[PDB]
TrEMBL record:
Organism this protein belongs to: Francisella tularensis subsp. novicida (strain ATCC 15482 / CCUG 33449 / U112)
Section of the entire sequence shown: 3 to 157 of 207
This protein's name: Type IV / VI secretion system DotU domain-containing protein
Residue ranges constituting the Type IV / VI secretion system DotU domain according to the UniProt record: 26-155
Length: 155
């Protein structure tokens, strides 16, 4: 089953709401960042009961990277001068998640059969327009391969 996917969907949902919204001050964004941080901890808690560290990483990191990408987009477009500190820096001291999502994805596809939740999580971020290093090239053949390939792992 999963209380996990319910948390993941909710993180995704609330993020999409933030971008769609016309006016956010830094207050609201901040409030949103902290709610995601609360959720991540419950997400990790639920994961570490059943799964390896590496598997939690494979699931949490892409989620953080999804959120950072979209908030970084909003922050750039935004009239208001809103600020965003990278979650992927906060949890993992790296900022190259535009790439790292795809190394995780490649591992998930090449290196083993991991629990289904790893495939679902990448799938979900991709079905929500996470581009990472392909932001300029939506039709990059590797990028399209990733989409087709992870989806062939789910029901
Ligand atoms: Au964890
Ligand atoms: Au495979
Ligand atoms: Au989709
Ligand atoms: Au799809
Ligand atoms: Au190919
Ligand atoms: Au699979
Ligand atoms: Na730093």
């Amino acid at each position: 089953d999963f209380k996990e996917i319910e948390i993941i969907l909710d993180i995704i949902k609330t993020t999409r709401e933030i971008i769609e919204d016309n006016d956010n001050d830094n207050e609201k964004i901040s409030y949103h960042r902290n709610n995601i941080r609360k959720s991540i901890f419950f997400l990790q808690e639920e994961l570490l009961e059943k799964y390896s560290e590496t598997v939690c990483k494979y699931i949490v990191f892409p989620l953080l990277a999804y959120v950072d990408e979209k908030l970084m987009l909003l922050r750039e477009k935004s009239a208001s001068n809103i600020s965003w500190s990278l979650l992927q820096l906060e949890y993992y001291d790296r900022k190259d998640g535009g790439e790292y999502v795809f190394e995780i994805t490649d591992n998930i596809l090449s290196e083993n059969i991991y629990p289904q939740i790893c495939y679902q999580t990448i799938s979900l971020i991709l079905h929500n327009d996470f581009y990472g290093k392909y932001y300029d090239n939506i039709y990059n053949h590797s990028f399209l391969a990733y989409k087709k390939e992870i989806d062939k792992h789910i029901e």
